[PDB]
Design a protein around this nucleic acid. Sequence first.
RNA 1: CCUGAGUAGCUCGGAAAACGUUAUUUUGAGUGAAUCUGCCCAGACCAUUGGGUAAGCCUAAAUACUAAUUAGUGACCGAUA
RNA 2: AUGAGCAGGUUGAAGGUUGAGUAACAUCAACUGGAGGACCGAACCGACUCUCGUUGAAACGAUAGCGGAUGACUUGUGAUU
RNA 3: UGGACCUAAGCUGAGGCUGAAAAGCGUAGGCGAUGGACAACAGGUUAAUAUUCCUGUACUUACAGUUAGACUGAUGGAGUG
RNA 4: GGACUGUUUAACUAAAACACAACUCUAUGCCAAACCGUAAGGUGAUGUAUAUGGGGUGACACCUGCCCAGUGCUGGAAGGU
RNA 5: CUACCCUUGGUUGUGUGCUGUUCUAAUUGGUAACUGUUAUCCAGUUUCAAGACAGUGUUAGGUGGGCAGUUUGACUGGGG
Lengths: 285, 145, 63
Amino acid sequence: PIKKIISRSNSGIHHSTVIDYKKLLTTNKNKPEKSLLVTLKKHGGRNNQGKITVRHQGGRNKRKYRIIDFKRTHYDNIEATVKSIEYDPNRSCFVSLITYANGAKSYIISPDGIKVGDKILASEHPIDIKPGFSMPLAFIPEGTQVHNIELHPKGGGQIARSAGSYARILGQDETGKYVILQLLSGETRKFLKECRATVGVVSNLDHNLVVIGKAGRNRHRGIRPTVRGSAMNPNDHPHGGGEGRSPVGRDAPRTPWGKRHMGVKTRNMKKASTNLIIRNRKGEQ
Amino acid sequence: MKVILKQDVSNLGKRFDVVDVKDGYAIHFLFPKKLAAPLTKKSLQDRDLFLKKQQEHYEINKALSHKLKEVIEQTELHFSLKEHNGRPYGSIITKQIINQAHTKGMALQKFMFKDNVRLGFGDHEITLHIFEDTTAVLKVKVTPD
Amino acid sequence: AKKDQLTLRGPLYGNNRSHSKTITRRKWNVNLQPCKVKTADGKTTRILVSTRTLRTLKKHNRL
RNA sequence: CCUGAGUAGCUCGGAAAACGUUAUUUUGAGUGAAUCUGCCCAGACCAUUGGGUAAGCCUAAAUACUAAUUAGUGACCGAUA
RNA sequence: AUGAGCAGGUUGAAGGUUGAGUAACAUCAACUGGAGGACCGAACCGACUCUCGUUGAAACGAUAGCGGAUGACUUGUGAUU
RNA sequence: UGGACCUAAGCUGAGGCUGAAAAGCGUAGGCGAUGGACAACAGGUUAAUAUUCCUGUACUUACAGUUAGACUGAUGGAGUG
RNA sequence: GGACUGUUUAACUAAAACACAACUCUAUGCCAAACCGUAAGGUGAUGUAUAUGGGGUGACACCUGCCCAGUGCUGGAAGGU
RNA sequence: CUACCCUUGGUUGUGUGCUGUUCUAAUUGGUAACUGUUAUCCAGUUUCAAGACAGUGUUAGGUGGGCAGUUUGACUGGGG
């Protein structure tokens, strides 16, 4: 839960909030387990040659990525024992260290409502209905919450893997695939029942409550201060410049490039994923 | 564009002969069962030569189809599937059959089968069509480990 | 490079025009079609072919 | 039997030809003939007629020049050149 | 990415224990606490200012201050656009 | 102290891919300390050297023969680093 | 006036400017939107909508009133083209 | 009665497109498995998903100061 701390600072006030991190987790100091960690580097919006591709990225602190299993099909039908819920500095979600019943450990996603010591299973057969279990979508009745859904069959959970993410079950299609799901984006997609996912909502739904409070906390995440479009030079980004603030220019102002950013439909219907759409959050299909 | 039919009557009312659909790429170059000879030589000198070649090809096709039907009756396949006490945990495809045929030294192509992925264990008998001429019948023993 | 191995031919180099005949350097690239080569090598692969050369090889039955 | 096949050509945008694309060469794209009887050429084309039969390869001679080896000459300069 | 630095001194918070108080609170008291884009203030960063110099000692300085001076830190090594 | 040891962001890059060419993407490798394990102290000495010249005070890991016991186990994996 | 601490035209102008937590609107479902080159390819990102990006406002609490007439943006079946 | 030509109903059917099918068999994949390999590059087989779609080239539409080059008169009691 978010909370504030009286810092007694002599430089203004702050509305920053921090989560207690200990009525839900443990071990506030880095004490990980070896052979399951990969050091990750940040790019700061730069390309493979060092040229800018993304804006205002930088200042992030070093983070060691935890080796998570996303495909989860490497070893199935072996029951795992939940051993810990570890903070993941690489993502808004948290990782979970589980121990298999054969003598191995792994990292998985942490949904909300799980406990340390529980037992889970990832198989291609129907299994116990607990948040975390994964099975073919044809075996799951409607009315549940699912996350970490893959688009590639046996590809690995990519869609809906941030904190406080879920999907609403909207029935199944005749063809044995194209299960209808309402996603947390305003869209509604027909996925593949061959593709699997981890049921349950992702933990940390309170991510909408945390407050950065100051520019410093934001910079250390990896978000750099950036200038507004109006304050840009008449040549770098021609929405202003010179003495005195001026009203914005032509209708539907531009990005650093000539594109619109308020009402332009930037998705095209010339892909196979177009047939996978039911609701497009701007009408139908 | 090729204008010579080969290996069969092309799925519609016709005689197994030269005449073809006016595409040259209808199924010709996409089917290994559609062969031909250069039309430059097939103006008038190759008429009887290709007639006798077609007759000889028909005869050997019948003979080798029967010989392969007899051979598959003694080369019964044997495979395994790692499963959760019979619960589906493995995949059965034509690929392992292709690999064992490879190791045997003989060739089995895509057109000798009509499946994509299969399933099943125990000892079971299958019957797959090859042409209107013959139809392959085989037996396979899959162990559900 | 934008060219097939049979004839290493790239785009043709011309000058674009308009209603007012505006000078503009321009290139017309080739309509290269990718197809599998049918031959005896050990394992067949996919190569690019020019459509006119494709017609020539089909009319000579080059597989 | 044959004398150089996606060949000459036709159509959409061009490039070279004195030409800013027309007789002539080619095509980025598509289509696509013919057989010495025939084919191409004869600044649109065509009749007759004239020439040659394209659609594979090569070649010294007359082709410019000096990093220079050397001999010779400068209405060439003479340490501001 | 690999490292270093912040002399010295203030300061008494959140948090947890205990007690008074209260049904439990709130409110207070003692204890760990030294947290804090916390403070003063060396070195250090910068130049917001006064003066001087203005073919200067210096192609931008001396100068007394100044804000920061445990972090929106500074610097070091190499690459980097 | 730097190499005959290894790695850092990263570079190059056998082969392979992209692009008229040049050249770029790009794998194994091969490089890449500013890091990591990495075996000596004191005193005397010259116009000019010092954990390096000299005196005493410890040795080091390789390589052999020699003495005795003993079976050892990586290139693979783990801990550690 | 700017909430604040802070960045800033090196060597004329340090802040009502910029940034800023946060609010708000919107595009974006993975080979994401998007960006870079042309292309492979790469970032976004070794990320997955509570995330990225852009526009506006810029402690704190409250409101932000009339309007789609023209333009932008979206959807569109009738008719002309 | 037989005949040249029709409007109008069914009517037979060719030659083309408009969509609705089905399939892969060309094609694509930054799905997965195996192999080179040991190598998340790349390549080959299978697989998965589409699939004659997409994408590319040809020719043209629509938007298109992101980007390129242009044009921006004279007299004028300075000039506007």
